[model samples]
Target: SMHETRFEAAVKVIQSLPKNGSFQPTNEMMLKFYSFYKQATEGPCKLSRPGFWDPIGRYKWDAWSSLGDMTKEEAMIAYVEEMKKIIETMPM
Candidate 1:
């Protein structure tokens, strides 16, 4: 359920966002979400460095193992949103 909720939220945010090759999360938001997600998933140690104007990198997860039991609907939205933020800037 949590996974689904997060995914859906991501989609809604992504779809609503305007396309821009330079799009990036604000430093504040990136830090906040990074902290939030880290705590939510109990991820291992990560650098807490600061002084960045925007999200320097994209967020990636092990889709199969890390996604948990999230539903399609739930992931649809959040995934979209997250992708939108990272899309153009991501080094795919």
Candidate 2:
């Protein structure tokens, strides 16, 4: 399933993030994780509407959840960076 595959990739990205000595995500670290989290989780919905942005708000600050906090540009950047890291770590 696409969802499962995406979820796994998301998990992989999280696992690749630098962990604390105790292997737990710190609040500050979680903030960075949150950036990636938003992209991984919401990417599908965004992709489904390739031609046009669904709900339109997705391009601004209400893609994943309301309250208008993040933007598509921010999400795109995080998504690209995380995916790049994942690809770089892949076994040749």
Candidate 3:
């Protein structure tokens, strides 16, 4: 209950971040954040691997799949910390 509130707030701010220029997270960082979000909100990955034709989809699948063993609670904690760092390190 306590963590759920902070985790939701973190997701809001993280998603609200700029998608252009230096504020924009790189593909790897973005994917890592996406994975945490998926794990925290949806549990483990549920879909099969996509075909090579869908490279972007593959990236997302792989990222989430990598955290397939994580728990929702753990993921929420991780997402919160990661977002804290992102906000802390963000440039003015």
Candidate 4:
């Protein structure tokens, strides 16, 4: 129950980030978000890897797939922690 509440709160925080400031997440950070979001919402990655020419797709697939068997709640917690770290380091 506690985790579910926290997870819902964390999702709200994440949703509000875009309107908070002009914070631009880096490519690496975007990958982390992508992976974590997918893992959190969809469980493990299920799609096939893209062709070599499709670098963006390949990278996204790899990022999600690399999460292995992480649970949804674990991914949500990790995503929240990561967002906190970035927010803390961001210039005000």
Candidate 5:
């Protein structure tokens, strides 16, 4: 029940982020978003890392890889918490 609440809240936060103001989330933050979102929606990284030429793909793969066996709910919670931290540290 709590996780459902958090997941719903997290989804709302993510949706609001892009449309609000000029909140430009950094590359690193975007990586975290992509990683956690994939991990939460999908399971483990089934595909291999991208070729060296595909730097963005490689980075995304690595980010998702770093999550190891974290569960979907856990990933969702982590994403929410990470978003909170980024928002807090964002410049006014």
Candidate 6:
């Protein structure tokens, strides 16, 4: 599919987020975005994991950790699609 084209645009959309957006995401959720972005940037999953049993960690950490095995081709789609799902919170 045309993931790269659409995928590239997805990050652009995230970058366009405003500071005063009505919606606020949790640290874990924000880390979810990080894992996707960082995972996309470099294979080895996210640089930081869990970070000391913070809040609601479990599968969220697992989701990104497993990506270390996935190829970048798929990782890009993962990031793009996942971001799209949460992108609904943008300044609503």
TM-score winner: 3
Clashes of each: 9, 0, 0, 0, 0, 0
lDDT per residue (tens digit) for residues 20-76 in model 3: 335855678889899999999899999999999999999999999999689998999
What TM-score do all the candidates reach, one by one?
A: 0.31, 0.29, 0.89, 0.80, 0.82, 0.58
Superposed on all Cα atoms, the candidates' RMSDs to the truth, in angstroms, are 10.8, 11.3, 1.9, 2.1, 1.9, 4.4
Worst 10 residues of 5 by lDDT: 15-24
- Which ranges of candidate 3 are over 4 A from the true structure? 19-22
Rank all candidate structures by their lDDT, best first, as comma-separated numbers.
3, 5, 4, 6, 2, 1
Instruction: Write candidate 1's Cα lDDT for 1-92 as tens digits.
Output: 76657655664554444454345555554444443344345433344433344334323222223445544443344444555566566532
Candidate 5 lDDT by residue in tens digits, 1-92: 78767767876776677787467577898898889889888977889899999999999999999999999888888888887787787753
C-alpha lDDT of residue 12 in model 6? 72
The lDDT per prediction is 0.46, 0.48, 0.87, 0.82, 0.82, 0.65
Top-scoring candidate (lDDT): 3
From the highest TM-score down, the ranking of the candidates is 3, 5, 4, 6, 1, 2
List model 6 lDDT by residue over 1-92, tens digit each: 58767667877766555454556555666666666766666765555667556645655666678666766667678768766777764444
Which runs of model 2 end up more than 4 angstroms from their true locations? 1-68
Q: Where is the poorest 10-residue window by lDDT in model 4? A: 10-19
Question: For candidate 4, what is the TM-score?
Answer: 0.80
TM-score of 5: 0.82
Per-residue lDDT of candidate 4, residues 1-92 (tens digit): 67667666766665666677676567898798889889988999988999999999999999999999999988888887887787788753
Clashes of 4: 0
